[PDB]
Amino acid sequence: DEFEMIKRNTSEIISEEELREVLKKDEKSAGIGFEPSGKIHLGHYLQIKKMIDLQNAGFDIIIYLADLAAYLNQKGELDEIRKIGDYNKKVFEAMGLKAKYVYGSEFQLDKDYTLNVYRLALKTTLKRARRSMELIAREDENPKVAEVIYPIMEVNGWHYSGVDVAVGGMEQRKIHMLARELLPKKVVCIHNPVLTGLDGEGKMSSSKGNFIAVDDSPEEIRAKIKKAYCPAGVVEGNPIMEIAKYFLEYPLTIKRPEKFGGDLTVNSYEELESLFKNKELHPMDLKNAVAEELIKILEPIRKRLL
């Protein structure tokens, strides 16, 4: 059903009971925001895929091109940030998402909005605001006051958005917790898992250059996958298995030379995981299949961008 379709491949739903209450409503809205990113990667796509799930489930979708957040988070000047946000919109549209796109700065600098930001700054401890930014803040040896304005800026955004559901990666959870504690309307928070970087050494991120971009060329995708961390039998923190879990359609046919066991059809990610944990499926053949199927999945996106 819709709940299950929404829940599929999420890390958590802050409350399932509250989301069930939302799904009874006819008019319901879900939002996500992104600091504009020079490259749109599989992390982004995972969340937009989830936004599409909600859209299919009768939700109106709003995407915040979070230009002011990105400004607060040291991404550059607003005019430049906004150009990147416009590029990001194009990618999201190429992904098949029709939604309303709003630049946070269209409303986040209004006088009454600001006064509410100050109101929330009185209710939010520095310690809690800092903790909320631990996975989000730009690396800074000398953390700026802007870092603790960021979470109250976003919390007030959620308040102003009027959405019933907020979406983001697990790293967003502490900011979302603040929103649920501070605001008169508790937003349902759907968190998506954070993908491991291709080298398996941290989470996948724009600043770490450890991601596959939705517009990477086939040859780039093949090279990135060839080189990725993918230890035999190891599923945990294996970025290739995660791509297989989050992006691929099943039944999945894995091509292999007969000398390695010949073509392999797997009817679910859970079978794939079993075959991989049991070492019936070698990294090399997993990689080849994941690279080819991923290329196919991203191709219509790469094709539109042009």
Ligand X SMILES: N[C@@H](Cc1ccc(-c2ccccn2)nc1)C(=O)O
Interface contacts to ligand X, rule CB under 6 A: 31, 33-35, 64, 66, 69, 104, 136, 154, 157-158, 161, 172, 175
Residue 139 DSSP one-character state:
P
CA atoms within 13 A on the CB side of 157: 30
Q: How far is the CB of 107 from ligand X (least distance, A)?
A: 8
Question: In sequence order, what are the residues at sequence separation of 6 or more whose Cβ sits closer than 8 angstroms to the Cβ of residue 63?
Answer: 31, 32, 33, 34, 51, 89, 92, 97, 99, 100, 101, 102
Q: For residue 156, which phi and psi values (nearest 5 degrees)?
A: -60, -35
Q: Identify the residue whose tokens are 């961390």.
A: 229
Q: How far is the CB of 169 from ligand X (least distance, A)?
A: 8
Query: Residue 34 or residue 276: which is nearer to ligand X going by CB?
Result: 34
Q: How far is the CB of 34 from ligand X (least distance, A)?
A: 5
Query: Residue 73 or residue 238: which is nearer to ligand X going by CB?
Result: 73
Query: Residue 66 or residue 212: which is nearer to ligand X going by CB?
Result: 66
Using DSSP, state whether 1 is helix, strand or coil. coil
Q: How far is the CB of 122 from ligand X (least distance, A)?
A: 20
Distance CA 148, CA 131 (A): 9
Using DSSP, state whether 166 is helix, strand or coil. strand
Q: How far is the CB of 14 from ligand X (least distance, A)?
A: 15
Q: How far are the Cα atoms of 250, 258, 267, 280 from residue 286, in angstroms, in the given order?
A: 14, 15, 15, 11
Distance CA 49, CA 5 (A): 11
Query: Residue 69 or residue 228: which is nearer to ligand X going by CB?
Result: 69
Query: Residue 31 or residue 283: which is nearer to ligand X going by CB?
Result: 31
Query: Residue 104 or residue 239: which is nearer to ligand X going by CB?
Result: 104
Q: How far is the CB of 171 from ligand X (least distance, A)?
A: 7
What is the bridge-based pairing of β-strands 12-14 and 188-192?
antiparallel
Query: Residue 161 or residue 238: which is nearer to ligand X going by CB?
Result: 161
CB 30, CB 165: distance < 8 Å: yes
Q: How far is the CB of 204 from ligand X (least distance, A)?
A: 14
Which residues face 102 on adjacent strands? 64
* Closest of 32, 24, 95, 38 to residue 65, by C-alpha: 32
